[PDB]
Amino acid sequence: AGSKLCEKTSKTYSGKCDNKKCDKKCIEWEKAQHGACHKREAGKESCFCYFDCSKSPPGATPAPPGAAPPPAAGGSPSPPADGGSPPPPADGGSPPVDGGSPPPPSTH
Incomplete structure (x- = not known):
């Protein structure tokens, strides 16, 4: 009938190599239980x-x-x-004048 464990080796992960992304992408793509990333072999993750x-x-x-x-x-x-740092309020120049200016955003 069927009964065993299945492990994937980035057979459809693609994209850079991260931590949570590797796991999430695994359960989101391979619907796995736990995933991990490792760099090796010609620097291949x-x-x-x-x-x-x-x-x-x-x-x-x-x-x-x-x-x-x-x-x-x-x-x-x-x-x-x-950690929460969206762009400035779109005022509108046309032509563009850079915009922004101080004071600086949150999170020092």
Whole structure:
């Protein structure tokens, strides 16, 4: 009938290599359970995700490439970015005069 684990190797991830993006994209594209990213081989970033398929027995026994997954690793980059900082109020010049000017936006 069916009962095992299915893992994807960025077979449809595309785009840059991120942390949450790799996982989200995995569950959004491959509807997996958990995904991760790793840079290696000519600097090529690969995304590996694992999700229960068919039934997923208590033994797991996924479908790896060669039965040799990556180490525990410890990367997952995600610096402090994007914290609420929209563009200025579109006044309208025509011709354009740059616009903006001080004071500066929020978040020092």
